[PDB]
Design a binder for this molecule. Structure first.
Ligand SMILES: Nc1nc2c(c(=O)[nH]1)N[C@H]1C(S)=C(S)[C@@H](COP(=O)(O)OP(=O)(O)OC[C@H]3O[C@@H](n4cnc5c(=O)[nH]c(N)nc54)[C@H](O)[C@@H]3O)O[C@H]1N2
Ligand SMILES: Nc1nc2c(c(=O)[nH]1)N[C@H]1C(S)=C(S)[C@@H](COP(=O)(O)OP(=O)(O)OC[C@H]3O[C@@H](n4cnc5c(=O)[nH]c(N)nc54)[C@H](O)[C@@H]3O)O[C@H]1N2
Ligand SMILES: Nc1nc2c(c(=O)[nH]1)N[C@H]1C(S)=C(S)[C@@H](COP(=O)(O)OP(=O)(O)OC[C@H]3O[C@@H](n4cnc5c(=O)[nH]c(N)nc54)[C@H](O)[C@@H]3O)O[C@H]1N2
Ligand code: F3S
Ligand SMILES: [Mo]
Ligand code: NA
Ligand SMILES: [O]
Lengths: 824, 118, 235
């Protein structure tokens, strides 16, 4: 509207707590809500911010822009100003807002705003057109098909791809509701996860070695001597962890606190090491902050992490830069790992391409004893460069071996941790099968009667995405064609028509979402969901800090919390089985008598490990029952780090800062277990693409864009900046292909074809590229392979392809900046 | 719509105007060269106002009829190249024969198959 | 590599006889994968009767035994073993051809003569062939002939938008008005000059689909003296 003023919140405005919807860090925010025709005064005591708008504010006093404001229209028709701004007193972010969280106000639902296209009612593709339908009809069709599939094929005929994460489109209520429905009620094993094509973990190896992947506090980043960032671009992907914790360390602002905790320990200037094939904005910003001499960029060859960590491990062992008393008292398998993982520096250097001097320096900074005698406190942070790297399981084996031998778990200022993606919020029954199933391959091969995508969009984010879409669109078409012949059918007849089409290659597709998305190209049924602020939601961040996001506004139309969508389906299925006189099947669908999301929190998180409870896997553990909504409210955006250790009315929730500080690991014997980590090169499937084609097709995040851009696609600023997925290319490579910024290219290989706009980047190595993943205009995943590790973890960062000029998009040249995103 | 959009087999993407014209004109050309005009079909506005008018009907008509020379053309509201008013015109009475002022001068107005307030 | 051949039989061994064999490259062969059962010597023993391919067996006592008719079990050469019906739209003549038909008078049918082989590579040197067919001929309806003031042994130009060529006039009562038939491929008056560039989806030409006009050049008295223009339709 007017772009040159904002409406201040009144002194008495309602204020609620909200955790950022988006990334792992889980920054704290406040939501101010007040009637549209009121406003605060500029004097500091006459507005809810307590800030003096009678004269210019100084730097750091506030984060406030029009994008952080909105006007909602509630179900009663009344209009309210909202303002969603970062909490200065939250420990996580200390009043920081990323560009992503900063837009939350704009991405709340309003009838005319960026959320205008939110799903408001059930949508049905009635054979040849999109129409609205009732919830009752939708449930009759969806539960009717599930029931028919259960009755004739059993659970193996009902497929899901569902979120398992926290924050918006996840969290403890929602993961329990969906997991109870899929696993305890329907009892299907045909379930994959939003980011990976089977029911598995990103962290099998570290878990099996006894080290759960979120084992420290954000404060540990402040206390470290050295931080490793492995397969990780944290300024862009975990912004406020990097900004509020890492950088203060590099700047010297935490030195006092280290020295206060450890009186007889030297603390040199902190340093940072990045293991990343690509020179990222994170590397550039670290060098601007700390200087070139305190940053090591180990620009490894794609896929060579295992060789790197085996060379480092070998070296620190030969140097004696390990903790022998620690190994002897608290570990198993060391002697074996020394032999299996042996690799010289020279061999390491040849495979990784990192010079020997740099391998030695990384080891010197990180593991060689300080003058005062203690080992450096070296926090090892890693993310998708190695989780989606060359053999997830083996890389983690290699890394954790180095970490364990050097005692970099369980000491303050250390940890070998995931940086995280989404926030975490997992409470589920056990997976009901005994094998890992590659769901996408099964669908491509023609299995399944019904597939539900639930708070994900694998059209944009599957590995080998082109194969997936081809198949799903075709299978979807069979069902649409069958529906076409119907006229005047009952719901029960239509269920029969669709079921028969699925015996002929068809697949009924449902999407449970905020938005239509690309899934609308194949879906027959879409159901409207609610996000945080339209519901209460609990989740935890990368240091296990659980918070409550408070409901403050109504959802669009009849949109519902995902846990209540799950209850709705369960209760429909129960009624159908009751009506068919099948008491035993009906009973499988008990336990969803839920009126509000809090019911799901009580039934799941708060029952875990309790007497007479079913088996429940929960990140809250067996003290989860000590957390209630009311107690979380009293904690504020500081919440509690899980697991909770005690609670009483006078001291509130008290939790756990760092894991493993007594040297008891999560194994049978309480020791940490070393593992062999063989170097086998690239997988043959990937090596064949590399042999045939010119460019390494690296892929991942951009700071400004969130995920599949489900909100950002409607944001005019976002679309003006990034109208099309971009591909960073070396300028010399660009000149060879006669392309420059704003040209469009085709990117292709044996797995597929996609498009991108060219973004010349001086820092990209010749023969390498970097494409934005997951986007709405040019899907990167078309050119990823089908290859996965032993646990069906994809090598999403492992693919090669060729690049062909399409043409110059003059409009992009006129409107998009192709200037450097690496700050100097 | 702000730019050419292409369904590149399995996804919507942007494309350039030059590429779009290479693909679109290239197909028309191939069809003309091998099948003649009968291979190129249109359904096109013939009306006025937004999405029509004298500039636009001429541009499209010249393209379809004088240049491509295709007869495979229908109209926005009817599935052939025809008129709503064949009979009245053949009887010698073009269908827009008065002024709005005539509705002010009438003794009686008939409204036939018509809901004019709406 | 692979052309160390001293005689043609070497090429038979390297090609036909390797089709479908172990260690063989991909080979498309009308002999199929039992081609190796055929050798020169075995063909000699078969004589001019040979063997109908594919060969089903061989032994010294029974010789080559082959295949008389295909598809007698109802198994066709498709993925499923069934024969597949196909849509067949009627779209009239191709535009390119229809345009010549609209502009010009005569259907310029073309093809074979019994006595003449192909492009007459031998026959052009044969004095009997050259006496009988010194120039490509064009069968024309006699009424059409009278209208153009031509008879047997006159020379005409045949032309359209694609080209121009020449033929000697051969009045034929059985030719329909507006239609003609010219000898194709010949050494004196090439018919193909007036065929169009139009092809089907797989670049198969409509060689029999062209129209043109016909113009008298003159009377070749020598052809009138030496060439029969009598009827080639026996009754
Ligand atoms: N090539 C390549 N592929 C990748 C990756 C990569 O690095 N490279 N990254 C992978 C990773 S780490 C991930 S996380 C995945 C992401 O893959 P997806 O999970 O498919 O992508 P998201 O954008 O996170 O999907 C969120 C979806 O849920 C909807 N939504 C949001 N809020 C809610 C809610 O409250 N309820 C419901 N029901 N829906 C909601 C959104 O509109 C959107 O459609 O992609 C993976 N794919
Ligand atoms: N701005 C923003 N932040 C987000 C998200 C987002 O969409 N937008 N998504 C969130 C999610 S769900 C996730 S999973 C995280 C992901 O966060 P990160 O994993 O930090 O981000 P990515 O860009 O996927 O990849 C990290 C780095 O891996 C490097 N890399 C690629 N191949 C290899 C390899 O073989 N070895 C190594 N060592 N490095 C390699 C790339 O060059 C890249 O810089 O970000 C989260 N934060
Ligand atoms: N004497 C002699 N014999 C030969 C040859 C030779 O040069 N001389 N050449 C050999 C070769 S290589 C071939 S391909 C064959 C060809 O043998 P045929 O195809 O039998 O012979 P053509 O004279 O090419 O044409 C066959 C007939 O097609 C008719 N025809 C023309 N247009 C149409 C049409 O639209 N539809 C239908 N249904 N019929 C039409 C013609 O009137 C003509 O009689 O002859 C072989 N045998
Ligand atoms: S504002 Fe949001 S996107 Fe991450 S860095 Fe903070 S939780
Ligand atoms: Mo992720
Ligand atoms: Na594609
Ligand atoms: O993730």
């Amino acid at each position: 509207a007017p772009n040159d003023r904002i409406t201040l919140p009144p002194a008495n405005a309602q204020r609620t707590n909200m955790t950022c919807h988006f990334c792992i860090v889980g920054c704290g925010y406040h939501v101010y809500k007040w009637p549209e025709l009121q406003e605060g005064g500029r004097a500091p005591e006459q507005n809810a911010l307590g800030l003096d708008f009678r004269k210019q504010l100084p730097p750091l006093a506030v984060t406030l822009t029009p994008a952080m404001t909105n006007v909602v229209t509630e179900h009663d028709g009344r209009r309210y100003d909202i303002m969603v701004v970062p909490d200065k007193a939250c420990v996580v972010n200390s009043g920081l807002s990323s560009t992503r969280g900063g837009k939350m106000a704009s991405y709340m639902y309003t009838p005319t705003g960026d959320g205008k296209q939110r799903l408001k009612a059930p949508r049905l593709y009635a054979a040849d057109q999109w129409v609205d339908t009732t919830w009752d009809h939708a449930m009759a069709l969806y539960a009717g098909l599930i029931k028919k599939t259960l009755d004739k094929d059993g659970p193996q005929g009902v497929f899901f791809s569902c979120f398992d994460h926290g924050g918006a489109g996840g969290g403890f209520e929602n993961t329990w509701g969906t997991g109870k429905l899929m696993f305890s009620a329907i009892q299907t094993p045909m379930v994959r996860i939003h980011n990976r094509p089977a029911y598995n973990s990103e962290c099998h190896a570290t878990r099996e070695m006894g080290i759960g992947e979120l084992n420290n506090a954000y404060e540990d980043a402040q206390l470290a001597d050295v931080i490793w960032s492995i397969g990780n671009n944290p300024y862009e992907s975990q912004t406020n962890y990097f900004l509020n914790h890492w950088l203060p360390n590099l700047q010297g602002a935490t030195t006092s606190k280290k020295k206060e905790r450890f009186p007889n320990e030297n603390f040199p200037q902190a340093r940072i090491i990045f293991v990343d094939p690509r020179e990222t904005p994170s590397v550039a910003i670290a060098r601007h902050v700390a200087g070139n001499d305190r940053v090591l960029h180990l620009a490894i060859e794609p896929g060579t992490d295992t060789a790197l960590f085996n060379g480092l491990f070998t070296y620190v062992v030969e140097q004696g830069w390990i903790d022998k008393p620690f190994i002897e008292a608290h570990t198993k398998g060391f002697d074996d790992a020394v032999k299996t993982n042996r690799l010289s520096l020279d061999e390491c250097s040849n495979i990784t391409g990192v010079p020997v001097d740099m391998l030695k320096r990384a080891a010197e900074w990180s593991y060689k004893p300080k003058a005062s005698g203690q080992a450096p406190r070296t926090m090892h942070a890693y993310e998708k460069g190695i989780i989606w790297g060359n053999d997830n399981y083996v890389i983690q084996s290699a890394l954790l071996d180095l970490v364990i031998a050097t005692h970099n778990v369980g000491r303050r200022g250390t940890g070998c941790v995931r940086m995280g993606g989404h926030q975490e919020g997992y409470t589920r029954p056990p997976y009901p099968g005994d094998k890992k199933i590659y769901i996408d391959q099964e669908l491509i091969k023609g299995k399944g009667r019904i597939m539900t995508w639930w708070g994900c969009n694998n059209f944009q984010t599957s590995n080998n995405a082109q194969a997936l879409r081809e198949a799903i669109l075709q299978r979807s078409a069979i069902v649409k064609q069958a529906m076409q012949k119907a006229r005047g059918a009952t719901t029960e007849e239509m269920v029969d028509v669709i079921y028969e089409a699925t015996q002929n290659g068809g697949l009924f597709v449902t999407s449970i979402n905020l938005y239509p998305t690309k899934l609308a190209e194949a879906a027959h049924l879409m159901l409207p969901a609610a996000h945080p602020g339209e519901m209460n939601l609990t989740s935890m961040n990368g240091e296990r800090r659980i918070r409550l996001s408070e409901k403050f506004m109504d959802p669009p139309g009849t949109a519902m919390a995902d846990c209540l969508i799950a209850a709705r389906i369960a209760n429909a299925l129960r009624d159908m089985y009751q009506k068919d006189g099948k008491a035993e099947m009906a009973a499988q669908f008990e336990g969803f008598d839920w009126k509000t999301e809090e019911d799901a929190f009580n039934d799941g998180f708060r029952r875990a490990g309790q007497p007479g409870a079913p088996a429940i896997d929960s990140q809250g553990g067996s003290t989860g029952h000590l957390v209630t909504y009311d107690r979380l409210r009293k904690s504020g955006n500081n919440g509690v780090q899980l697991p909770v250790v005690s609670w009483d009315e006078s001291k509130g929730l008290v939790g756990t800062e760092m894991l493993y500080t007594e040297g008891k690991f999560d194994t049978d014997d309480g020791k940490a277990h070393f593992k062999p980590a063989p170097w086998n090169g690239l997988p043959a499937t990937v090596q064949q693409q590399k042999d045939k084609y010119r460019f390494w097709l690296n892929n991942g995040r951009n700071n400004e864009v969130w995920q599949t851009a489900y909100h950002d696609q409607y944001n005019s600023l976002m679309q003006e900046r990034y109208p099309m997925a971009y591909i960073e290319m070396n300028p010399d490579d660009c000149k060879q292909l006669d392309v420059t910024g704003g040209d469009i290219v085709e990117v292709y290989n044996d797995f597929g074809s996609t498009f991108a706009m060219v973004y010349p980047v001086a820092e990209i190595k010749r023969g390498q590229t970097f494409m934005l993943f997951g986007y709405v205009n040019g899907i990167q995943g078309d050119v990823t392979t089908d290859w996965t590790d032993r646990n069906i973890i994809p090598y999403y960062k492992g693919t090669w392809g060729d690049i062909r000029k399409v043409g110059s998009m003059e409009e992009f040249k006129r409107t998009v900046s192709f200037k450097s995103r690496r700050f100097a």
